[PDB]
Amino acid sequence: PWADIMQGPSESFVDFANRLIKAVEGSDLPPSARAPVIIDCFRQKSQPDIQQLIRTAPSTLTTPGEIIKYVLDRQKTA
Amino acid sequence: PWADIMQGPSESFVDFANRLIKAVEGSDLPPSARAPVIIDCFRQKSQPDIQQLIRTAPSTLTTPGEIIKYVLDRQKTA
Amino acid sequence: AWTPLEPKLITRLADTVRTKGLRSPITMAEVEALMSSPLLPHDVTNLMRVILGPAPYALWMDAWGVQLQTVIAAATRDPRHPANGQGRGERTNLNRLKGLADGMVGNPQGQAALLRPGELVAITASALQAFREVARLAE
Amino acid sequence: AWTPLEPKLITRLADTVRTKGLRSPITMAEVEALMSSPLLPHDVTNLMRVILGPAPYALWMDAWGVQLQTVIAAATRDPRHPANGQGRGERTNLNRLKGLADGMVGNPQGQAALLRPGELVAITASALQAFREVARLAEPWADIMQGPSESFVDFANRLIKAVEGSDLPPSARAPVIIDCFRQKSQPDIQQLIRTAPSTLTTPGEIIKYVLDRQKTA
Amino acid sequence: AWTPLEPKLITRLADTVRTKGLRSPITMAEVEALMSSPLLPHDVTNLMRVILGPAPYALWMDAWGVQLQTVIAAATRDPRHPANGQGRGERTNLNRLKGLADGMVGNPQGQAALLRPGELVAITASALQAFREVARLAE
Amino acid sequence: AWTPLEPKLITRLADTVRTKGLRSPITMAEVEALMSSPLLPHDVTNLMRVILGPAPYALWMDAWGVQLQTVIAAATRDPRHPANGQGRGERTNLNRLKGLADGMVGNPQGQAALLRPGELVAITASALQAFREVARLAEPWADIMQGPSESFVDFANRLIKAVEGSDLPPSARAPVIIDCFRQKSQPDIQQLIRTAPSTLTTPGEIIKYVLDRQKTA
Amino acid sequence: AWTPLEPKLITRLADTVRTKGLRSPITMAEVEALMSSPLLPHDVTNLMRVILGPAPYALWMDAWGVQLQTVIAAATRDPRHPANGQGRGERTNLNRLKGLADGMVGNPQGQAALLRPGELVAITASALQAFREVARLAE
Amino acid sequence: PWADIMQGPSESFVDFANRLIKAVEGSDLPPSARAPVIIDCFRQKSQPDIQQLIRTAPSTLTTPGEIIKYVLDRQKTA
Amino acid sequence: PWADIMQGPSESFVDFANRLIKAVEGSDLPPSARAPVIIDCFRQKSQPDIQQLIRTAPSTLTTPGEIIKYVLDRQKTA
Amino acid sequence: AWTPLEPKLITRLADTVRTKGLRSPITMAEVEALMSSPLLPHDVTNLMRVILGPAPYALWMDAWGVQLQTVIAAATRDPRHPANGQGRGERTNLNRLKGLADGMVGNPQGQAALLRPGELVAITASALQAFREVARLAE
């Protein structure tokens, strides 16, 4: 179930994005509703450090690929 | 007193902005000194998460309304 | 001749905004109700001053200015705007829309005198869209 | 006539990407191999759908779009693009490059019919550059030292890899590689490079000199 | 018309270079095999980019440039080079040999269009000699 | 008319070099101060004789000769040198630059008579560059990190100093300084530079941005 | 004829900047003192090179360029600039302001020859404003 | 006396070079005979470790400054 | 036999060069193969101090006389 | 007509070099004695082959070549060399100095035929200077 996917405290972001995109594209949603759902799940899941990282984006991110690129650039190396 | 207003740890930002604008406009300042004071109080009060959110603004915010809009857009949903 | 809105209706609308919030469908319906007749910039400005708090009022002033600027861009993109005229001497400046033009600053009677009905309806629609934006933004 | 790529080659390439990763030189060589003939947007799109995971695939779609947009800007900046024509009626829109134009959506045969060879090679080069970007993004030069027991060719390989796969401009890589050869590369090789009767002005020349005069041990 | 080399053959050759090394007679035989048809500068450049590591690739670029310069000196020493022509307008510059000339940078199709067969065989022999030098130098 | 430098200023500068060393920024600032007006070869030679010890003075004579030779090569490469003239009879020989020409050996008055202002400024710049070389030689950029307690302007000063006073080409200093700002400068400032809505393409712009948005503490 | 500033005054000013900082009113007064006579681009450039550290010097170069660009915009907005002339042949380019024009690069004598007094005072005021900006920014 | 100057067993090389250049330039030699004497004194004095370091110089050193630079580069840190 | 000639631990270099050139020129090699053999025997014989001295030659030595001159210049006086 | 040097004098000089060494003043005097008449390249070459060992002979060949090259540079710097002529057809190449030119290789008679007396004295002085260099270098 896509709506139950959370980014674990120790999980990296690319694994979380892979799992989420897999569960959203392999589901019962229409094809035209996958990108907005993936974006809004990146924003509300993806534990509050990345949540604030996406929130304070000086540019407007309108695609899952752009969000992934931005987060991978500005992520907290740890 | 406007210079004693802090954003509480649990208080939202719109309540803090309302309280601050109320106390600044209902005070003894000249009319031409309210906007700069409100801006500089948004920047130095408004606990360090929002302080850093305003500091790292790719655009220059030159009005309390613009600062409020920016912070409401990029705020950490919690 | 300018007639002010009832302070009783304004008080009821302010309490509605206070209890239900800015985004409830009942609040938007009430605003649409009090936004029925074309209002002068003075009326809408005082209405938003009374019903909205300080910070939402600042946000609303910003949004109203932006929407009025979009309207004026569309107006310079089409000389057949119901606010415009046929000649260049009737072109509508933002000072005339925001009520800042000559003979209008602080005077609602003169405002109602010089303003066009198309000007009034454009100002009103702009204010409604700005209210919607601020309501969607505040919460 | 459109001929699909072998699913056997695609399966082998997918397992290569799965074990070696996106950035290994063997993986890039394999991608260059399967990127030999000019592919139609359908082919490259399905290839990246199969070999890449979901998140790298999203990143790659983004990067491919950006590179194709740069290509279309260069195309409107020069009417002599091998994808363009002489008249204005042959100007190539991004719907035709991404395979979204009329008569192409979902149909590889019609795609192969209407597309130009210049269009195909431009799409292919764009996709290769996008793959390189995403590979560099999915997974520090100034922290690289030559270990006490490490040979010099391994150190040079590691350093050139980290310098070329970094955020430096292209015109700043050679001087940085040289000055890192001189200051890293433990003091025996440091003195070997310092006492060079000739002036070495290229990483290849420094590597050749050091390999010639190195202390066999 | 330009046809690329098979990535399967290139992968097999890369693994051969990886296990046997650069100097084994089997590796040189395999390189001679994949060096049979006259290759365009694009082909040889990408081939050496894939089969060789970074440092051997730098060494090979150096050696290839030196050998091509010797070829161009012999070409200016004899106007009957299979890469040259009879008039002075067909003299071959190093930008045309390394693929850096106009209409060739990054485009293998245009490369194959403007290049001569003598140019191709000279480039190929130069690249083979450079590979031999680098292989003798690396180990 | 030639006027000598004050022995009081020279004594103060000599004691500065004696206590602070050759490489301190205060010492280089003092040298730039006493290198303000264009000096005659006699002045610079005696100045370096007094402020520098014997071995640094030998090194400085060597470096000054090399830099003057580079200047004379550039002068024979361009007949429009402010030291040269239009005809061939005004070409400037190294005997005239080092003060060894006829009518100049040991005589500062005649020196000041025959020398050109362009000659003087070229000699002065050459001597300054030679002093910088010898100071860097008498007593590594890729090892510079911003300390946990160090401010950012101190780190930037140290890094720019070590990068500009090194063996890199002049055209490779700005990219290296930028990429060292990005990878050094402990992860708070690293993330501050990473999340820059604008693209920063100059060390000054990066410094300004970081100074604006830095965490006051 | 160009006369350099005393290295004694420059050393004293550098030590003042070193002990008091960039923003103290005594430091700004000292800078105003050494900014009394109109300086040539060479003078101000070397002065800021000596008194400022590397990073403040980079910031100051940036700010000086921006202020000079504002000056040149005002100059193209008014043909009566004391740096400009009446005809179009006296229009002042940024290469002439920053000392980069022909006959000026590295030569202070030629600089003093070709520059106008209005040019000098504009450059000086621009440099002073840039110093103020950088001082307000550094601390 | 310049011809009696030796580099002590514990003395550094820059001190020895300073002392030697001082004694050679402040002596009765002609000006055109100081550099060759300084070089040949660097080569024969300057205890046998530095003697062998100068002897095995792949380049030809023809100036006291160049010899000093070379020795300072390749000296045995101790 | 030329291929059995080694520079002894205590032997000087000119004696070794004399012995090697004697044995190479008084042998069964063609005249056009003596110089390369003498060079490659200087490089592989001539105990590792001189081997490294010849290896780290900033110039390319392409003649036995040039190698002998270089080694005699930069040899470790002992 | 070419006359060879006496093998008795050459044997005595070889034994002198063997007992006294290369650098003794008596040895240099003896060499100056046997270097009195201008010798052909054949004579000096065989003389140095006999009196010098293998390694000093290699060194001497090197030094002789270098000195002859300096002589040829001075010759191209002055068309009035006693080895040169007035026209360009008498310019002396190093093949003619080292005895490598056409009609001279291995034949001393033809050598003596085509060579100039200025050529002979220049070759002789060059060989003497080269001998001095090698003698100073060997010990």
Residue in chain F closest to B44 (alpha carbons) equals: F216
Q: Give the contacts of B63 (CB within 8 A, at least 6 positions apart).
A: B35, B39, C58, C62
Per the CB < 8 A criterion, the answer to whether E82 and E116 are in contact is yes
Per CB-CB distance under 8 Å, the chain A contacts of B53 are 56
CA–CA separation, H61 and H40 (whole Å): 11
Core vs surface per residue A9-29: b (16+ CB within 10 A) or e: eeeebbebbbbbbebbeeeee
CA–CA separation, E33 and B44 (whole Å): 73
The verdict on I15 touching J (C-beta cutoff 8 Å) is no
User: How far, CA to CA in Å, does G79 sit from each of G84, G86, G123, G126, H46?
Assistant: 6, 7, 17, 19, 73
Contact flag D195-I55 (C-beta cutoff 8 Å): no
Per CB-CB distance under 8 Å, the chain A contacts of B67 are none
The verdict on F57 touching H (C-beta cutoff 8 Å) is yes
The verdict on B60 touching F (C-beta cutoff 8 Å) is no
Chains that touch F (3 or more CB pairs under 8 A): A, B, D, G, H
Please name the member of H48, H51, H58 whose beta carbon is closest to the beta carbon of I74: H58
Testing the interface with D: which of I55, I60, I66, I70 to mutate, by most D Cβ within 10 A?
I55
- How close is the nearest chain H Cα to the Cα of F61, in Å? 8
Testing the interface with E: which of D20, D27, D208 to mutate, by most E Cβ within 10 A?
D208
Half-sphere CA count of E132, side-chain side, radius 13 A: 12
CA–CA separation, I73 and H75 (whole Å): 20
Q: Give the contacts of D104 (CB within 8 A, at least 6 positions apart).
A: D41, D96, D110, D111, D114, D115
The verdict on A59 touching F (C-beta cutoff 8 Å) is yes
Helix H segments across G1-139?
Answer: 7-20, 25-34, 41-51, 54-76, 94-97, 108-114, 117-138
Q: Which of D173, D186, D177, D176 minimizes the C-alpha distance to D214?
A: D186
Alpha-carbon dihedral B53, B56, B62, B64, rounded to 10 degrees: 0
The verdict on A56 touching B (C-beta cutoff 8 Å) is yes
Half-sphere CA count of D68, side-chain side, radius 13 A: 23
What is the fold, at CATH topology level, of the domain defined by A2-74?
1.10.1200
The verdict on D5 touching F (C-beta cutoff 8 Å) is no
Please name the member of I52, I55, I58 whose beta carbon is closest to the beta carbon of D197: I58
Contact flag B65-C56 (C-beta cutoff 8 Å): no
Domain ranges across chain I: 2-74
CA–CA separation, A13 and J135 (whole Å): 78
User: What's the CATH class of domain G1-138?
Assistant: mainly alpha
Token pair, residue E1, equals: 């018309």
CA–CA separation, C97 and A69 (whole Å): 44
How many Cβ atoms are within 10 Å of C97's Cβ, its own excluded?
Answer: 24
Please name the member of G4, G18, G109 whose beta carbon is closest to the beta carbon of F37: G4
Testing the interface with B: which of F194, F200, F210, F212 to mutate, by most B Cβ within 10 A?
F212
- The CATH number for F141-213, chosen from 1.10.760.10, 1.10.1200.30, 1.10.150.20, 3.20.20.60, is 1.10.1200.30
The verdict on D168 touching F (C-beta cutoff 8 Å) is yes
Q: Phi/psi at J59 (nearest 5 deg)?
A: -55, -40
CA–CA separation, D132 and D138 (whole Å): 10
With 0-12 / 13-18 / 19 or more C-beta atoms within 10 angstroms meaning exposed / middle / buried, residue F139 is exposed
Per CB-CB distance under 8 Å, the chain D contacts of F183 are 140, 142
The 3 state secondary structure assigned to chain C is CCCCCCHHHHHHHHHHHHHHCCCCHHHHHHHHHHCCCCCCHHHHHHHHHHHCCHHHHHHHHHHHHHHHHHHHHHHHCCCCCCCCCCCHHHCCCHHHHCCCCCCCCCCHHHHHHHCCHHHHHHHHHHHHHHHHHHHHHHC
The verdict on D197 touching H (C-beta cutoff 8 Å) is yes
Residue in chain F closest to H64 (alpha carbons) equals: F58
Contacts 24+ apart (CB under 8 A), J84-88: J84/J118
The 3 state secondary structure assigned to F107-157 is CHHHHHHHCCHHHHHHHHHHHHHHHHHHHHHHCCHHHCCCCCCCCHHHHHH
Half-sphere CA count of F37, side-chain side, radius 13 A: 16
- The C residues from 63 to 102 touching B (CB cutoff 8 Å) are none
The verdict on F164 touching D (C-beta cutoff 8 Å) is no
Per the CB < 8 A criterion, the answer to whether H31 and H24 are in contact is no
- What count of CB pairs under 8 Å joins D to I? 14
Q: Per 3-state DSSP, what percentage of chain F is helix, strand, and coil (rounded to 5)?
A: 65, 0, 35
The 3 state secondary structure assigned to E94-132 is HHHHCCCCCCCCCCHHHHHHHCCHHHHHHHHHHHHHHHH
Token pair, residue F47, equals: 């100045």
